Design a protein around this ligand. Sequence first.
Ligand SMILES: C=CCNC(=O)[C@@H](NC(=O)[C@@](O)(CCCN(Cc1ccc(-c2ccccc2)cc1)NC(=O)[C@@H](NC(=O)OC)C(C)(C)C)Cc1ccc(CC=C)cc1)C(C)C
Ligand SMILES: [Cl-]
Ligand SMILES: [Cl-]
Ligand SMILES: [Cl-]
Lengths: 99, 99
Amino acid sequence: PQITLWQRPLVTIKIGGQLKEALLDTGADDTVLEEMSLPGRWKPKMIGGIGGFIKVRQYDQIPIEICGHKAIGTVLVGPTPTNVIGRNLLTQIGCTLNF
Amino acid sequence: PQITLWQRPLVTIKIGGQLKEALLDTGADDTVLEEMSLPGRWKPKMIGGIGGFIKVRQYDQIPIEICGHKAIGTVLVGPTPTNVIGRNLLTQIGCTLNF
Ligand SMILES: C=CCNC(=O)[C@@H](NC(=O)[C@@](O)(CCCN(Cc1ccc(-c2ccccc2)cc1)NC(=O)[C@@H](NC(=O)OC)C(C)(C)C)Cc1ccc(CC=C)cc1)C(C)C
Ligand SMILES: [Cl-]
Ligand SMILES: [Cl-]
Ligand SMILES: [Cl-]
């Protein structure tokens, strides 16, 4: 699709059997989701932005589906104020900025 | 242009006669720049990121070039980790997401 920026670019994702809304965030290096359960190994991480840093769990190799596009990547889980899809996954669905 | 997301979408902006690097950021409602001088009066604004809230100075109707594309709009100045161009100015330059 072509996605306008008049509004926040929110999409539906399927992850871990769950349906979730997330923001397509070209300013995020990583994908960060609100608290949720994921399978497999994780390690702690600190990620930072306006207002400072938060602690997350980093899960690698997580299957995600965004707009019918299957991808696989790292998902960070923690007390983010909003679900964000970062570049790590945006690349995998072939997403670009165009002007 | 068309910008892929395998790296940070950093571009050059020009504001008040100077060049800076800024991040094209679709997850951001607003454009926030690191500490700098701007003409005229400013208003207070709180903006929230991953780490919580900062106070910034809001300047209105500020001419800014983004990738040679001319825009005039609101610029926030505050303690941001990086210069970010948010959707307020991305829409002015005709930016969309595409996949
Ligand atoms: C460890 C890797 C480096 N860190 C990052 O890449 C992180 N990225 C970000 O913080 C942003 O991409 C910002 C994410 C987008 N957020 C997503 C976001 C959206 C809403 C909220 C929110 C806050 C309070 C209440 C309700 C919602 C929080 C985060 N939006 C905002 O921050 C905007 N907020 C906004 O538009 O208000 C709606 C701002 C810029 C005006 C503050 C911008 C950004 C990119 C990169 C860096 C660091 C680069 C050296 C710092 C900031 C992380 C999310 C992956
Ligand atoms: Cl990844
Ligand atoms: Cl590509
Ligand atoms: Cl504006």
